[PDB]
Structures are given as C-alpha cells and as structure tokens.
Symmetry: D2
C-alpha cells in the first residue's frame, strides 16, 4: 500500500489509460479524483468505490482555467491536500501538415498543451507551499515526431518541455515533475483499426505485444511514491522498447 | 555562392538572429524576404540591398494565417518559388509556473508555436509539389527546460516535435526540415538583461563568450545548401557547448 | 513483497550504491548474490542475512570472463535461476584528455564496459532460454560528458549503447534491459572528494541534496518487478533533476 | 575554398566514408593526411594528388599509441600543424550478445573506441597549446542500439561520450569537438548484401535513398570551417531522417 493517505487527481480518467492509472493508484491506497469532461467519469469513480477505494468524479474541461481552479478547490474540500496530479487528458485531431485545419490545430494545443499547463499551475501553487508533491504528465512517443501529427507532436513535446521546466522550479520545494511516454497501448482508440494494421504496429514493438492501461498505471504509481523522490524531470517510455 | 538563384523567407529578420541569418543567406547569393511584424524590417531589407543583394520586406504577423498566406503569395510574385523557409520569429513572456498569466501563456504559444506551424504549412503545401525545399526552425536551448519559461519551453519543444514530424512527411519529396537551438546569442533581447545575469550565462558557456547572429546564420546556410540534403529532422545546438 | 521467490545478482554490492540496491531487493523478498572483487562483500551479505534475507557473497572480478562464468554457475547452484542482474560494479581513474595514461584508460574500459558486457552475456545466455529476465545497468550522468572523464564517460555511454542493443535482441523473449544513470549519490567514492568540490556538485542539483544509495535501489526494484515489464531500453536518471 | 591553408588528418581514409571525407576536405583546399592501416591508402593519396590537392599517406594502426604518436609527428613535419582531425577508422565484428566472442569484443573496442581516444589525445595535446582546432568523430546510428552490435554500439556510444567530454575540456581553448552519425551510407561494406535486403533498408529511410560518402564529407567540411566555431559537443545524424 505505497500511496496510503494520499490524494490524487487523474485527468481524463473516465476511460482508457487514465482509468487504468486511477485503478492502480486506488489499489495502492490513494483517494482518487476522476477529473474528466465526460459524465461517464461518475461510473469510473463508482467502479473504484465498488472495489473498496475512496473516489469522486468532478466534471472538468482542463482547457478552461476557471473549471480547473474549481476542480482543485473541490478536490481539496473533499479529500484534503492534492499530493499527486496525473495529467492524462488528451485528444487527437490528426492530419498531414499541408492539410491541417486551424480549428484542429487550435483544439489539440488547447487541450493537450494549455490544459496540461493550467493543471500543472494549480498543482504548483499548492505544492510549493506544502513542500511536497508529485506531478506526472502523460506525453506520447509522438513527441519526437510522427506522420499525420503536427499538432499532436507539438503538444506532447511541449508537455515534455514544461515538465523539465517545472522540475527546475519545484525540485527544491520537495516536488517531482516527470513525464511518461506510452508507446502503443491497447485502448478504445487503438482497437478500432483494421486487424492488418494492428499487426504492423505490433511488429514495430520489440516486446511483441501492445501494452495495457495498467502498464502505464504501474509506472505512475512508482513515480508517485516516496521511493521516486530523487527522479525528477524524466521522460520514461512505457512502450516495450518501441522506437516510433 | 552556395545558394545562388534561391529564394528564402526569414521570419523575424528585422533584427537580431534573424537579421544575421538573412545576411549570411544573402552573402551566399539568396534572394531574401525579410518577414517581420515590425516596420524596421524595411531598413533591414534596404541594408541587404545596399550590400548588393536582392531583398524585400514584407510586413507579417506569423500568428495570423491570412497574413502568412499573403506573405507567401507576395514573396513568390516578387522572387519566384520559395526554396528556403527560416522560422526565426519568436518572443518571450517569462514567468514562474505558479505566476504565469493566461495572456502571457497564450501570446507565446500563438507566436512561437502556432506561428511557426502556419509558416511551415504554407512552405509544405508548395514544397511537396515542387519536389524540393528547405525548412529550418529556430528553436532554443530552453526546449529541455529552463527556469521561468513554462510557456517558452513548451513552445520551443513543440517546434522540435513539428520539425521531426515534418521531416517524416516531406523527406521523400526531397525536402529537409531541421531545427537549430541557439544557446546564448548576443542580440537586443539578450543585451537588455541585468549585467549580473549576463555574466552567469557566460560562465555556463564552455567556449567562454556569447555567440553572434552570424554563427546561427552559418549553420542555416549549410542546412539550406545541397550538401545538407541528407540531414533531416535534426536538432543542432549552436551554443559554444552550452548545456542549459 | 514485489520480488518474492526471485534471485538477483548485484555486482559491486559490497558497499555504496550496490549495497543499497541489494538492501532494497532483499526488502522486497529477493535472494541476493553480492558479487564483488572485495572480501568486504562477505560482511554485506552477512548484514542482509542478519536482517532476515537470504544472501550469499561470491568473490568475482567482472573483467575476467572465467570468474563471471563461475559467478553465474555458483549463484544458480545456491539460489536457482538468476531472474535479475544488476550491473553496478564500476571504477573511476579520472584525468584530463591530454594527460590520461594508457593504463588508466585500459582499466576503466576493462571493468566498466567489458565487465558489464561479460555479465550481460551470461545473463542473456540463460534468460533467453527461460523466456524471462531483468537486466539493469548502472551507468552515470557522465555518459553525455564530464570534465576529467574521457575514460569514464566512454565506458558509461558504452553501457547505454549495449543496454539498448540488448533490449532489441531480448525483448521478444520476455526480458527487459534498462539503464539507470545516478546523478550525485552520497557513497564512499563521492565522500572522499575535496569539500569545495562537494559544494559545487550540490549547487548543480535542483533538489538541493545528494541522493542516497536507496534512491537508486528503489528504481532498480521497480524495474525488476512485473509492473515494469513494458519498460525496455530506457535510460532513467536518478539525480534529483541534475543536468550534468 | 573554406579550408585553404589547413592541414587535416582523416583516419580510415583509404576507402569508403573516410575517402569521401578526404575528397571534400581536399576540394575545400585542405592538405590531407590519409591515415590508414591498409597500403591502398597510398593510392587514395595519389588520387587526391592527381586532382590537384596536396596529400600524403601515412601507414598507421590507430589502436597502437606509438604508431599514432608517429602519425602526428610525421604529419606535422610534412604539412605543418594539424588543424583538423577526423576519426573515421572503424570496424565491425557483429554477433548476438549471447554469442559474441571475447576476441571480437576486444578488437572492436580496441579500434573504434581506444583508437579514437588515442588520436583525440594527440590532437588535444597540440590543439590546446595552439588555441585552435577541430576534432570530428564518426560515430554511427547504432550508438543508441542495434541488433547484433553489442560491441559496435558500445564502441560508438563511447565515442559520443568522449566527444562531449572533450568539448567541455577544450572549448575554452578555441577547439570544437563534434560527432557525426552516418545512417545508411553506400560503401563497399553496405554494397555486399543481397539486393532484396538493401531495398528493405532503403524503405526505412524517409529520404528514400542511401547516402554517399560525400554527404558525410560535406558535414565534416562545414564543422571544420570557421563558420562552425560555435557548434561544439554535437551529434549530427547524416542519415536522411532514418531512425535506426
Ligand atoms: N492510446 C494510446 O495508445 C496512447 C495514448 N497517449 C495519450 O495518453 C492519454 C490517454 O489516452 P487514451 O486512454 O488512449 O485516450 P481516450 O480518448 O481513451 O481517453 C481520454 C479521456 O480524456 C478526456 N478528455 C478529453 N478532452 C478533455 C478535456 N478538455 N478536459 C477534460 N478531459 C478531457 C476524455 O473524455 C476521455 O475520458 C492521452 O493524453 C493520449 O494522448 C499517448 C500515447 C499512446
Ligand atoms: N538570443 C538568444 O540568445 C536566443 C534566441 N532564440 C530564439 O531566436 C529567435 C530570434 O531571437 P532574437 O534575435 O534574440 O530575438 P529579438 O527579439 O531580438 O528579435 C525577434 C524578431 O522577431 C520578430 N517577431 C516577433 N514576433 C513576430 C511575429 N508574430 N511575426 C513576425 N515577426 C515577429 C520581432 O519583430 C523581431 O524583429 C527567437 O525565436 C528566439 O526565441 C533562441 C535561443 C536563444
Ligand atoms: N556515487 C555516485 O554519485 C555515482 C556513481 N556511479 C556509478 O555507480 C556505481 C557504484 O558506485 P559507488 O557505489 O558510488 O562506488 P564505490 O566505489 O563506493 O563501490 C564500487 C563497488 O564495486 C566494486 N568493484 C569495482 N571493480 C570491480 C570488479 N572489476 N569486479 C567486481 N566488483 C568491482 C568495488 O569493489 C566496490 O565494492 C559505479 O558503477 C559508479 O560508476 C555513477 C554515477 C554517480
Ligand atoms: N558504411 C556505413 O554505412 C556506416 C559506417 N559507419 C562508420 O563510418 C566509418 C567508415 O566506414 P566505411 O567507410 O563503411 O568503412 P570501410 O570498412 O569501408 O573502411 C574503413 C577504413 O578504416 C581502416 N581501418 C580499420 N581499422 C583501422 C585501424 N586500426 N587503424 C587505421 N585504420 C583502420 C580500414 O583499413 C579502411 O580503409 C567507420 O567508423 C564505420 O564504422 C557508421 C555507420 C554506417
């Protein structure tokens, strides 16, 4: 029970990787705020409660500062000081560089990059006064480039930059800020693809299988623990050796 | 005369690194569009003309798609197909993570990241049809983190991500896309800093001095030449060995 | 008890980081072989036994293939199949590039690089047949350069290269191979340094203090567990955010 | 004529990449020492002389300190102070990690890593007193791992480590030390492979073709010039965007 008596916000935790992260944190004893724009977040929180954990859904669009301020206020009123923030919420609006619309650019930056910043900021305001904390950002293997992902790669590389900046500003205050880059993970987004394509992606992964949400969760749980106090500003790939 | 009969757009070329880049490109025979939001860009273009080069100022705010579309239209009407794009325009609005205003976040992302995207997009639309081209993005040593630069580091890491994405999309079309990360360069932006700070930055540079605009220019000119056809998706530091 | 019923070899585990790693692995239930060239390794093993763990010292100079073959034979006779190898043993013989003697070059490469290879090889021979395993190499922040460390940086960068190579060869066989780069850790090697130097290294560490052996140990224990099955070929810095 | 009145040693310049580098340096006006263990080096030097350049073959096995000392003595007696050292000489003795013989390990480290060190050392002794110089090391895309190349990847990552170390020690003395990582280059070593295999390797290169020796040469020539004085400790890939 490595995270007993700790409070964690996981953004985008209604489903997929976020939900897997929330399960693992809950398994290790954390009180978990499921922060999501979608109301299925209530079902995710309920699922954690049914397994014996303490959990609460808070509706939040991370791209809106006032909603993010409200998320942190409410979270702390309910479960006390936020020890752990996991910035997992994100979207794709893929297109080739020459075709990408301004709207599809704007929206991906707004959620993945700005939204992540807004949450990091709220965590930082609080954590720097308490002298403790964990911020863990979910980036992507696409941060060093991927076809069709000018907006997404920009946003996720941006997240890595902020991660490293925040490490420098907050490390002396007892806070760690790290990034995880999932490789190819089995979720709803990756499942709905022709089976021939799936096999091509698998053949790019030296380990020979797609990861699960819980593989990302295990790495988050480790970075969130006291044993990872000296890991700061890192980018850890969770992709079975896969070089995108 | 490595760039004879080539047309280059250099954004942010009214002063500083951009102007140095434009000088070197002009020295190697390029026709140079000085693209800048500031009207001093006319004086910069005039200075190149007085030295014997062909040059033209076009007023442009790279954050506005319609102005960027106009920049490329006019550039091509005047000097023919754009062979080389140098995305140098950028700004700082520094602040610690816990203090950074939403406006200061927005503006830096809008210029450095989105602006760079808009220009890359216009270049890509054209260059992929011609089967030739050079895109060179000026990032920063701050892309892997720097105190006070949550917004700036996000934006510049983002530029690195897009650079690598564009390399993957465009390399087979005979186009290279690379990034230069200047370290500490002597310009108007770095000169207007307390003298105590300047000395701290100098002591971080193994070479023992601040670089000049022309040092960045020389690297741009090399990447722009036919001899660098096989360099693609690279991040080259021009910082006298400086590890930020 | 994440490593119950697992057998681990930790090279260089008589003292310092190696001994800390061995403690943490033992705490999580592993049977630990203390492999070291120094006979104080018997005391380290005894200390683990006195705390309730199973542990055995085996004398070994990792630079000698025949001794490494003997280490693995004996280890397996005593505690059964080796599930985990931690290549921690290493030395410094620092000197500026222009002064470094051939003997001091030879010895550092022989231990840090070749020794690590020999042990990796023995682990690989066995692990690839069993379809399971963990190899964790202790590299150094010096792998991307450090004054006075031509031989050491060469050796540790070399270790990173082998780590990534081995990930590619072994991942499909259910084995992970990862590297940890400690930053500045408080051990016998770092304590025996002029006090003026110590203070300079501390001022480079954003966290504000030198790490302990157990900080490296916690990261090893995580990578050795089933929860890190999808982390492969990584280089994880354990240095309180320190950029050397 | 960017390198007029400069003296360059290129190791391994009897054929392949080394010979291409020597051609480009000679084209830009350098006096070139072809340093090689093979006597075909005399023919390579003769070929440069027939094109109008000044060139000299010196027999040298870079793994032997006394021969390297002799190489630098003779080179300077013939063509005056060595301004540029290109450490290109290297070998492969590939094998899987579990099969690699001790002899094949030893020989690759001895040539690629130790040999490169010995030459760097001789250059450094001289260049640090003169207050000027260029060292350019040919590494490989394999430095971040490649199947069957435990020894080669170790050796080439090692070269990158030394490169960065030497940058830190020598930058303040007006010397730059950089590394080039060729991707997939058309030489005698790469030509002797079944044509079906070659096409698979080509399809992994975003640029869509294999590089030539002269592509590496162009990058060396640039780094060797005065225009690259502010590039130091860099690893530049010359591989058409190819991520190994
Ligand atoms: N699927 C994969 O294999 C990989 C995923 N990632 C990243 O990991 C993270 C999780 O991805 P998945 O589970 O695959 O995605 P998903 O789409 O299954 O889940 C995303 C969740 O975030 C929420 N969300 C979206 N926009 C939001 C906003 N503005 N405010 C609050 N919540 C919002 C959604 O409602 C949803 O519940 C994302 O950041 C994704 O980009 C990175 C690499 C690979
Ligand atoms: N000076 C340094 O040490 C470093 C500079 N950089 C980057 O290099 C680039 C140039 O830097 P400096 O010359 O120091 O900057 P500077 O501030 O001296 O000049 C920047 C130029 O860019 C133009 N510009 C700004 N926003 C624009 C827009 N939206 N549209 C069109 N033009 C615009 C400005 O009008 C100005 O002419 C910037 O992107 C900067 O972030 C990166 C690392 C270090
Ligand atoms: N302390 C620090 O801040 C850092 C340490 N490291 C690395 O961490 C590892 C451990 O370092 P410390 O515990 O600080 O050093 P240490 O010198 O205190 O302990 C080294 C141990 O390894 C053993 N060893 C040396 N050569 C050997 C050989 N040929 N065969 C078997 N055993 C051998 C020694 O007998 C000793 O027991 C080393 O590889 C070192 O390079 C890396 C970065 C920072
Ligand atoms: N061919 C390729 O695609 C790639 C080559 N490289 C590296 O680039 C460099 C040149 O490669 P190639 O031209 O293909 O090699 P090559 O095998 O065609 O030529 C290498 C030259 O180095 C010489 N040499 C070998 N050992 C020596 C020693 N101990 N002292 C002095 N000279 C010695 C040989 O006699 C030969 O003339 C090597 O370091 C190689 O590992 C790296 C990545 C890809």
């Amino acid at each position: 029970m490595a995270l007993a008596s700790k409070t964690a916000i996981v953004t985008g935790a209604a489903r997929g990787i976020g939900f897997g992260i929330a399960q693992v944190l809950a398994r290790e004893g954390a009180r978990v705020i499921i922060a999501d724009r979608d109301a299925h977040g209530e079902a995710a929180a309920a699922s954690l409660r049914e397994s014996g954990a303490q959990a609460l859904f808070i509706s939040c669009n991370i791209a809106e500062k006032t909603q993010v301020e409200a998320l942190f206020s409410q979270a702390e009123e309910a479960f006390g000081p936020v020890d752990i923030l996991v910035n997992n919420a994100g979207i794709n609006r893929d297109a080739m560089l020459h075709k990408l619309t301004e709207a599809d650019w704007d929206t991906v930056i707004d959620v993945n990059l700005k939204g992540t910043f807004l949450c990091m900021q709220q965590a930082a305001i609080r954590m720097r006064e308490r002298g403790a904390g964990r911020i863990i950002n979910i980036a992507s293997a696409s941060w060093l480039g991927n076809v069709g992902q000018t907006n997404y790669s920009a946003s996720k590389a941006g997240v890595v930059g902020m991660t490293k900046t925040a490490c420098r500003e907050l490390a002396k205050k007892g806070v760690t800020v790290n990034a995880i880059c999932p490789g190819f993970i089995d979720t709803d987004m990756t499942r709905g693809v022709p089976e021939n394509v799936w096999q091509i992606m698998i053949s790019k992964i030296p380990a020979g299988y797609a990861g699960e949400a819980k593989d990302v969760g295990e790495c988050v749980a480790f970075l969130a623990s006291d044993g990872a106090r000296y890991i700061n500003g890192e980018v850890i790939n969770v992709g079975g050796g896969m070089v995108l």
